[PDB]
């Protein structure tokens, strides 16, 4: 063979659950597979990793000799390779828009929101007091920005026209809420909109390859 | 035609970028509405935008706001202006990693510089902890963009919105005083970036000469 199928680089349960999701809508829709390598923490840190990807980051999609980063760019290429698939939720480019504007919003806003959450700033190790006013502000910040997500969901039953890569970026991020017991029950929209995106079979499917059925 | 809600110097102008290379290229006007930080807190902006946020792209009924959306809907409706340096899937994504590292993760580490954490304010070693952060931050992903330009001249096979976002980001740290003439490539890169004509006409409307 001359032609190796597309390889995703991902941490199970992280942002790179993603690109994860858009590949296999791929394999589903338009009958290509793919190859998913799921990495360790440390394994990122590792030589052989970082002779890939100095960034040291995932996700990292390999297609042939183009090795690239970044979720966003990920699944707009996957989309311009594959229009047929849907990814963002619909083939017509205001209603694409549309959906790349909520991806774009929990990938460059609501993501950062939970970084003190998964890794305290080092000034406030050690301070008891610190470390609860920061990561009170923080849950206080992924309110604010999952209300507006809520609202959206108020006459809408996803963030594209059908299912799109912005529906799978909130549920891994909800995903994250729960694991991290950060309760968002007063936000009726948020539990129905993730056993909607559960009943997707290619949601289904990488849920099932990245272990996160409970 | 579209408009375009902006800030000055901002991030939006990014996507001011896009729309004049539009024009140039495609032969659409636009309009462009410089907005104050007071205006994007009105009652007549929150209305438009309930993120109260810019950029604001309006396209008749379509209201889109964040850069990455508004750049890649433009890059769709008008292929021929290479937005992204290039007409080719693989060149438009590498081009769109760029973009990306430079909005989601470059962007984000000025933002305590800009707006201090309100747990910092009154807090002089703590401030000073934070802004210290935030341009070692910078400096090293400044330091791996730096390194990308050893051997190539732009962040696409030719100029691109990717291009446009670390130029943005790099007249923000020569206005906060964050220097980066360690690294050799950014100096020439400005000056590139400068004599593109989409660039020279926004810097000009935007006052930023
Ligand atoms: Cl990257
Ligand atoms: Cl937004």
Redesign the interface.
Same mark, same amino acid.
């Given at each position: 063979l001359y032609f190796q199928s597309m390889k995703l680089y991902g941490l199970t349960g992280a942002c790179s659950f993603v690109p994860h999701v858009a590949l296999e809508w791929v394999k589903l829709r338009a009958n290509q597979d793919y190859a998913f390598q799921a990495v360790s923490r440390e394994f990122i840190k590792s030589a052989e990793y970082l002779a890939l990807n @100095? +960034?040291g980051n995932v996700p990292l999609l390999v297609?042939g000799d183009?090795a690239? =980063?970044?979720? $966003? *760019?990920?699944v !707009?290429?996957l989309d311009?390779?594959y229009p047929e698939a849907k990814l963002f939720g619909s083939k017509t480019? +205001?209603d &694409? *828009? &549309?959906a *790349? +504007?909520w991806? *774009?919003?929990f990938? %460059?806003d609501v !993501? &950062?929101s939970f970084v003190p959450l998964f890794r305290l @700033? %080092?000034?406030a190790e050690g301070n008891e007091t610190?470390t609860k =006013?920061?990561r009170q $502000?923080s849950a206080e910040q992924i309110l604010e920005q999952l209300a507006?997500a809520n609202a959206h969901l108020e006459n809408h039953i996803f963030f594209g026209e059908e299912i799109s890569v912005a529906d799978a970026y909130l549920y891994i991020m909800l995903n994250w809420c729960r694991l991290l017991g950060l309760d968002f029950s007063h936000l009726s929209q948020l539990s129905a909109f993730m056993q909607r995106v559960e009943a997707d079979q290619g949601v289904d499917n990488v849920r099932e390859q990245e272990g996160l059925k409970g």
């Open positions: @100095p +960034r297609d183009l690239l =980063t970044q979720n $966003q *760019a990920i !707009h290429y311009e390779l480019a +205001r &694409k *828009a &549309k *790349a +504007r991806l *774009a919003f990938n %460059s !993501h &950062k @700033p %080092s000034y610190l =006013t920061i $502000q507006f």
